[PDB]
Amino acid sequence: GLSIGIVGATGQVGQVMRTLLDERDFPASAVRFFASARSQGRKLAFRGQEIEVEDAETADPSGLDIALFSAGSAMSKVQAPRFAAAGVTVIDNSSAWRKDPDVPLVVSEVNFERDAHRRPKGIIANPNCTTMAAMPVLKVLHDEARLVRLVVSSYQAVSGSGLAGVAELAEQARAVIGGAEQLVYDGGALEFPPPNTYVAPIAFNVVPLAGSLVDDGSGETDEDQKLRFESRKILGIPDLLVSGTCVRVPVFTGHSLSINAEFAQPLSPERARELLDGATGVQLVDVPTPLAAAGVDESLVGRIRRDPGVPDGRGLALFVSGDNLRKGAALNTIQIAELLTA
Amino acid sequence: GLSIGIVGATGQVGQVMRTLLDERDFPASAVRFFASARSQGRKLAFRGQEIEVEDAETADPSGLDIALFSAGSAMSKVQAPRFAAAGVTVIDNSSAWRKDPDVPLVVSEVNFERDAHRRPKGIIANPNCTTMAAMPVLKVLHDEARLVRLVVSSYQAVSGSGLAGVAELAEQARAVIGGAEQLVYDGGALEFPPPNTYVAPIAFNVVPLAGSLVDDGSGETDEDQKLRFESRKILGIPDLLVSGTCVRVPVFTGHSLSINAEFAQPLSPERARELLDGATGVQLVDVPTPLAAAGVDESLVGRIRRDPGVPDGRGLALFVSGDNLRKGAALNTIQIAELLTA
């Protein structure tokens, strides 16, 4: 019955959107693909036929029920309203609409019922991938005990930066692997291909800098701040206290978060495990890892401990890993599309 | 004038001890090396001559002024008292003596003057490498504002596990690098050499598990707990609140820490930078990385921000990287030896 479009169909997220529409048997009677000029004209196979890659800027959106955007914020600022004007419900995987009070910022199993129905601009915004990984986990704990403060340190995979991050990690690793053991005694022993995407080499390194420094005197990047703004909007906690540090690691796909979460009443590790074991979009594991998360749908959560720095057992430390291309981007937009058409 | 010994001279830390004794022109008129049977007999070059590798268990310690141990805790429990009995001041890089109230646990520029002189057992304990990286930084901030709570998430290099960790990371990376991009869509796409040292693959992964689970019902590992016990003893803050999560990353050498530190009075990022820029054993940088830290002596510190989850500007978030074989192990023992013989 449904007509679906994918805007930005050739990028990594677009590819995963395509794979998931197919794998999840999304009941779309028509599927359309869009990219930008010079990518358009080409056809891409989808379930037994070849689909034209149309021009997102100039193609006619009429007829589409839902469009999944993963084409950057610039494209979204212009095209999402154009599509919505043509009657299309837009689900946007970009930062363009996230701060707009008339655009719900939705994690499918968290705040769909609460926020998704109120969309006067015809747009639903897809959350930041790093934040998204934590949301199915934190929602469950919040409902139980009321979340009041987060400390977060992330371990972010390079596919977060698109193909460019993947290529930068791969080319560096390939160039230096031959002399790798020398890095044990001298981090400058080898010749790394010059970094381009990242501020330092990423292979065999960690880089505590993701994004642009916000012009607010804070020293925080926009990615650091997304953890604050988006957790607040998604969980419906306008005054949530959040301190996040986004750190890039040499992992291809799978973002991880070391989370110290404080609640308004005591919440034990045993009780947190009991609640998360049940939970939608969550899998309880002893040691979450991004390799285990990459290619699967659920947020992996474990290493749940009391944080003694919070009085009276109101604080936990826990670790989460999640696929940043799947739940972190493509999958969530599709789950929203599923709930919209249930 | 001085007579120095190195017990465990053939391991990674022993190698760095040897390199540094040479590079730092340590005024030892005699240098002796020790390992265990089957490593002994061999000679190792040191500054213009070849030194016999003696048997740590059966050799006679008499004559040595100082012995630097990096031979594990089991060996230390027995041999450190034997050496101390023979009049040797023992500086031990192991966990054996760290919890002993009659053994100072010393970071050279932090608590040497305060604690080192009181050593009734003839032993000074070298701190955990992960904790050690943070100590020259936190001491300076503590002196200014009084440190009261830490949250810590680490990014720990594999040389922390000796040659075995280095080899496990190298062999895995070499085996899978050919098909690496497949990990973007499926973390289980490739055949990793089976892990042995770590609970999961380490190449292109992160593994939130370092050490043995403590039999105290906490869910914490012994490495997680070292951040609590050792920070308390080193900084002289018996009731310091600490929550740490130790996470292994695919880095050869260089441990990193994302630290959220709370003080008893307001401490601004600007003021923290002013204090650390001066500081002994510290280098202020925009983006600390373990590749930059590996092969150098100072703790690299930056990304200093206010943590808004702490009222009234009493909380910071900051990031530290430090070489775990140098300051984290070998260098600190040598700096203590230097201060003992100044």
Curated annotation (Swiss-Prot), chains A, B:
Active-site annotation: C129, H255
Keyword field: Amino-acid biosynthesis, Diaminopimelate biosynthesis, Lysine biosynthesis, Methionine biosynthesis, NADP, Oxidoreductase, Threonine biosynthesis
InterPro entries named among the record's database cross-references: Asp-semialdehyde_DH_CS (IPR000319), Asp_semialdehyde_DH (IPR012080), Asp_semialdehyde_DH_beta (IPR005986), NAD(P)-bd_dom_sf (IPR036291), Semialdehyde_DH_NAD-bd (IPR000534), Semialdhyde_DH_dimer_dom (IPR012280)
Binding locations of phosphate: R98, K226
Residues the record lists as binding substrate: Q156, R248
Reaction catalysed by this enzyme: L-aspartate 4-semialdehyde + phosphate + NADP(+) = 4-phospho-L-aspartate + NADPH + H(+)
BP terms from Gene Ontology: 'de novo' L-methionine biosynthetic process; diaminopimelate biosynthetic process; isoleucine biosynthetic process; lysine biosynthetic process via diaminopimelate; threonine biosynthetic process
Pfam families per record: Semialdhyde_dh, Semialdhyde_dhC
Pathway the protein acts in: Amino-acid biosynthesis; L-lysine biosynthesis via DAP pathway; (S)-tetrahydrodipicolinate from L-aspartate: step 2/4; Amino-acid biosynthesis; L-methionine biosynthesis via de novo pathway; L-homoserine from L-aspartate: step 2/3; Amino-acid biosynthesis; L-threonine biosynthesis; L-threonine from L-aspartate: step 2/5
SUBUNIT field: Homodimer.
The protein, known as: Aspartate-semialdehyde dehydrogenase
